[PDB]
RNA sequence: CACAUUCCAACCACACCUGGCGUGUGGC
DNA sequence: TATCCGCTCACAATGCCACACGCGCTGCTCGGCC
DNA sequence: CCGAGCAGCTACTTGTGAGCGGATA
């Protein structure tokens, strides 16, 4: 009896499960309380249990694990850990875990931790033998992520001029910036695919902050990988706490000397979020923004890096612009110059139902001589040269066409000479 | 033979009278009949959190154990210094010292 | 009983409090301090 | 036992001697709690220490030595020094100290000054007889600070068109305005570069305010100089702190009759900070910036100048403009008279990858007669005459061939004939 | 179906205060 | 070895009334299943 | 690191009665 194996399954396998179990009726409950009064008969049959889960650290000194299930928030099961284990065992935020626990004895009300067996996927014995994140030396990106699938599908054009536009790597530095309903969520869902499809090995993890639930449901089903969300349903309390939930989990599987891909959706709602939660310090400028208040995405963004040891943290944000209010705007600022790489997609492209609408010259990357070979990189800056003097809309379609004739981008390379 | 006898300080000066012990065994040159102050305060346990992630080098009862060779001048030495209100031990005024068994188990304390 | 130990509220955050109070307050801190060492194997001498 | 010692050296040697010298892990602990527990581990062995640092003046009275490894911030290994030394001894900020140190002693957190044994790379005897900065008498750039290796290089060409555009002096006061992807950090690395080969008497120093990481670990080990540097990671208060700390130790040292030269990229970082930590005075003008949110830049700025007895402060900072935002302009404008010296980059030539793109006649220096002779004055004259009538961009490509063909700059000269 | 209570025109309920202890002084 | 003598410790020493006042500073240690 | 409660910085009374050695036959 695993904590997962209940934690996945759909609420419909669990109230069969539960019916068979001769229980009361498990309808009349949430999915946590499902879980936990399941897990509750079941070790009422004398079953010891196992569980997993990523650590939260507590002003208090103990610690809880929380599931993908919950979007790592506070719950009927959530596991709690003794501030001893984690001074013995070295946990922190972040800390996956998974280990013997038991349903809260006589009078408690959360899960036991007993004995721990997997720390971030590594044997706990090596968990204390890791590498901090801020004593890290981070560099620019040298393996290349190539995103292009290669078969040749409609849609995977939206991922070859990925490759033509702006050229990703382990450990990037990416914004995109575009206004409202210009085509952003399909462009990270087929980067999400992408990604799955071509880097298997590499974590992929997706951060959606004060989203619509139907673009939850979609996404933690069409990617082949853990996400996690939170809609407009919620508090911005609760958009800050899974911000640290995930980005302490990056943190410490990049410790762990691991490839973590991160995908942010939208960095405008968890800045509202982050300038909403924050307290006021006297200090307010245009828009109506703290100027404290962006320290926390300062952080957040700052925290991706290249790592030299091994392992990188890639975090790929997405910023809205021209959405009628100059605070959007004055964050959208100073994201301007932080970030060395952008996707900049105009509204203008997108209003013609031509996609993706991406504006191919206002794109780049900065430092991606050591992303490419050098015939890869002539050839990017002679075709930056061809498309520099037309305008944005048709130039974008020539790209398009010259695309859709080739199947991958060899032929099209070929075919620019 | 360097013994592992045991001192009680005031309440608190625990660390202040360690040190002042030593400073008094560095001034009459008696370092041949002591040891060091050995302060068993091993008591790294902290509390982590928002902004808030410091040690607390504290929490252990106040017995600044010192191990030495017991000798009267010795102790009238280790006495002499103030705040030593506290040298335990069952006897008239000569005790005996702790056993190995206690040594180890005050240094895997120590270890841990 | 807790209403007949002297405990008021005097002008201010302190409050007139009564010599029982020291006394139990005390004997709770040493217990709980022998209750630890018990736990720990502390040495012989020192738990006496 | 150095604080230097252990300052330098990678995480990496740190963690081996730890390891050696029989610690608990120290792989859990940051740089500053390594070194701060591997000292206290060295000293109850019974060692006397030594260490250094820059001063901090705090407000209490008391002062702080920091570190280049904590950008000079607060830090467990910070050496504390009472207000009585910083009396007799006459400290202040920016005075580098190097002496006898202890770890705090019984009940104490921060380590304790002892005996001082080098004030500023001197006797701490001759540290009293010391003149102050505004006392002096500036003056104009005299002494010439040839920027060519002479080597050349494929790169070298950015140093030679600067002994054709725009001459640099000890003491000078340069700006360098420019948008941005135009070519300032790899043009700010190579003025590192040339001044650590040609002038390594003088003291080198460069200011990263709110920069990228990747840029600030590849700037740490390609210049012959200790670097300081603060990212996007931490708030503005950090970037005014090292900013204080930067300046008072390049006054320090000019005052010890030392040569310093600063380049600090980039100054709208620093005014956005400045703007950002200082309170509201009701003075708002266009851009969101205070009437006196100005004056810390204004004094960073014009701590610049040239002394007569001995020594000078060059400081050459980096601007932003063309950034989409009005305020940036503001505060472009405010520095738009007040340098005597101009490096203009323009994003036209840098868009078509012709490096270096600078404006050769929107460049200049003024009172540049007392920099060169004679000989080298007429020639500048000829080919200012000579640039003036044709354009920026393939003018810039002129003069970039007519460069490329001699080895030094007296060839060019001698074919300008 | 059964157990168990029912949140609002005057007003009943929502009140009123430092000898814990010691010291000093004075009176009978 | 019983037994008187000398040294040591616990316990006591109105009652009422009236007025006035007080228990600090630095330092140390423990406080916490959402 | 923050907050809350708590600790270090003697002798002019005299008398009475009971108890614990103690030393003498
Ligand atoms: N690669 C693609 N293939 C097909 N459609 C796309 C692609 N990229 C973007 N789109 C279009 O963009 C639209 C995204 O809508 P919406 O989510 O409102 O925009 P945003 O992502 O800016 O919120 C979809 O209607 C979709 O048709
Ligand atoms: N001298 C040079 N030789 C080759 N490439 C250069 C040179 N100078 C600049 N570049 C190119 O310009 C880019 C510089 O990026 P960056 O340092 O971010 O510029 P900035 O700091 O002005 O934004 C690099 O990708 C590099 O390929
Ligand atoms: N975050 C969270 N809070 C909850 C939940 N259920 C109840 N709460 C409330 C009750 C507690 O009084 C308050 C937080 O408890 P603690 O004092 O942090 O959260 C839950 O599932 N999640
Ligand atoms: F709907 Be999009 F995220 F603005
Ligand atoms: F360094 Be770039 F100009 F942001
Ligand atoms: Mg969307
Ligand atoms: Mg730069």
Redesign the pocket.
């Known amino acids: 009896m695993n904590l997962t194996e209940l934690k996945n399954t759909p609420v419909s396998e669990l109230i069969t499960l539960g019916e068979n179990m001769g229980l009361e009726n498990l309808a009349r409950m949430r999915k946590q309380d499902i879980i936990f009064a399941i897990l509750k008969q079941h070790a009422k049959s004398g079953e010891d249990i196992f569980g997993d889960g990523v650590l939260?650290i507590?002003?208090?000194?103990?610690g809880?694990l929380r599931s993908a299930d919950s979007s790592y928030l506070?719950?009927?099961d959530?596991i709690?850990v003794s501030p001893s284990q984690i001074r013995r065992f070295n946990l922190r935020t972040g800390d996956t875990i998974s280990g013997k626990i038991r349903p809260?004895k006589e009078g408690?009300?959360?899960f036991?931790l007993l004995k721990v067996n997997e720390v971030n996927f590594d044997k706990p014995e090596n968990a204390r033998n890791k590498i901090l994140f801020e004593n890290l030396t981070p560099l620019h990106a040298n393996s290349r992520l190539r995103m292009e699938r290669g078969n040749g599908s409609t849609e995977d054009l939206t991922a070859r001029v990925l490759d033509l536009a702006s050229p990703i790597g382990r450990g990037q530095r990416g914004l995109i910036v575009a206004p409202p309903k210009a085509g952003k969520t399909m462009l990270l869902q087929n980067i999400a695919q992408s990604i799955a499809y071509n880097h298997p090995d590499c974590v992929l993890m997706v951060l959606l902050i004060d989203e619509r639930p139907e673009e939850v449901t979609e996404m933690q089903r069409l990617v082949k990988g853990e996400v996690v969300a939170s809609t407009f349903d919620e508090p911005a309390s609760r958009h800050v706490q899974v911000a640290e939930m995930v980005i302490e989990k990056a943190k410490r599987l990049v410790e762990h000397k691991k490839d973590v891909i991160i995908l942010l959706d939208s960095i405008t709602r968890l800045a509202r979020a982050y300038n909403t939660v924050v307290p006021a310090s006297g200090k307010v400028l245009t828009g109506g923004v703290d100027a404290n208040a962006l320290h926390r995405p300062k952080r957040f963004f700052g925290a991706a890096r290249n790592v030299e040891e091994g392992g990188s943290l890639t975090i790929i944000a997405t910023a809205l612009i021209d959405t009628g209010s100059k605070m959007d705007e004055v964050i959208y600022e100073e994201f301007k110059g932080t970030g060395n790489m952008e996707l900049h997609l105009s509204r203008k492209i997108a209003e013609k139902r031509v996609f993706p609408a991406i504006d191919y010259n206002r794109s780049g990357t900065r430092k991606e001589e050591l992303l490419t070979t050098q015939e890869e990189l002539q050839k990017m800056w002679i075709l930056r040269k061809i498309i520099h003097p037309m305008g944005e809309i048709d130039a974008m379609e020539f790209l398009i066409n010259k695309l859709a004739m080739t199947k991958t981008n060899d032929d099209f390379f070929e075919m620019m000479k | 033979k360097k013994r592992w006898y045991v001192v009680q300080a005031?309440?608190?000066?625990?660390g202040?009278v360690a040190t002042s012990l030593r400073e008094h065994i560095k001034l009459h040159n008696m370092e041949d009949l002591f040891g060091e102050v050995m302060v068993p305060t091993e008591e790294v346990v902290?509390?982590r959190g928002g902004?808030?992630r410091?040690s607390?080098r504290?929490?252990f009862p106040?017995y600044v154990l010192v191990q030495m060779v017991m000798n009267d001048a010795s102790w009238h030495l280790v006495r002499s210094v103030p705040?030593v209100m506290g040298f335990i031990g069952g006897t008239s005024d000569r005790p005996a010292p702790i056993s190995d068994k206690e040594v180890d188990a005050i240094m895997n304390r120590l270890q841990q | 009983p807790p209403d007949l130990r002297?405990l008021?509220?005097?002008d201010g955050g302190?409050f007139?409090?009564?010599?029982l109070?020291?006394l139990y307050?005390?004997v709770i801190?040493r217990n709980?301090?022998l209750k630890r060492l018990l736990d720990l194997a502390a040495p012989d001498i020192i738990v006496r």
Chains 1, 4 share one sequence.
Do not use: C, H, M
């Open positions: 939260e507590l002003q208090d000194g103990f809880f506070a719950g009927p959530d709690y809260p408690e009300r959360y036991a | 005031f309440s608190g000066f625990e202040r902290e509390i902004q808030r410091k607390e504290k929490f106040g705040r | 002297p008021v509220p005097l302190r007139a409090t009564s010599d109070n020291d307050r005390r801190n709980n301090r």
